[PDB]
């Protein structure tokens, strides 16, 4: 199903583009405040089919998928659009 490319942390992309990636590397640990995630310029950002583009989130806040992965969607909107996943 889909087209999920595998990505390793810390990761980043830039410029407008629609994408879908997968990772097995989120920290589960509530003291790992340095392993956080943020965006704003992106038009749409989702984990496992549910949106988080409006906010920051910590990797230890995000529940895993049915197989134990995290799957991450991204979308085009602006030519200077940045992101980073810690």
TrEMBL record:
<protein>
    <recommendedName>
        <fullName>cellulase</fullName>
    </recommendedName>
</protein>
<comment type="similarity">
    <text>Belongs to the glycosyl hydrolase 5 (cellulase A) family.</text>
</comment>
<feature type="domain" description="Carbohydrate-binding module 64">
    <location>
        <begin position="4"/>
        <end position="86"/>
    </location>
</feature>
């Amino acid at each position: 199903s889909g087209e999920y490319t595998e990505i390793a942390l810390p990761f980043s992309y830039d410029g407008a583009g629609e994408y879908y990636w997968k990772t097995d590397q989120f920290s589960t640990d509530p003291n790992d405040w340095s392993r956080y995630v943020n965006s704003w310029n992106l038009d749409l950002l989702e984990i496992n089919g549910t949106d988080y583009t409006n906010v920051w989130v910590a990797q230890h806040q995000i529940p895993a998928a049915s197989d134990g992965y995290w799957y991450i969607h991204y979308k085009s909107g602006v030519s200077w659009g940045h992101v980073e996943i810690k």
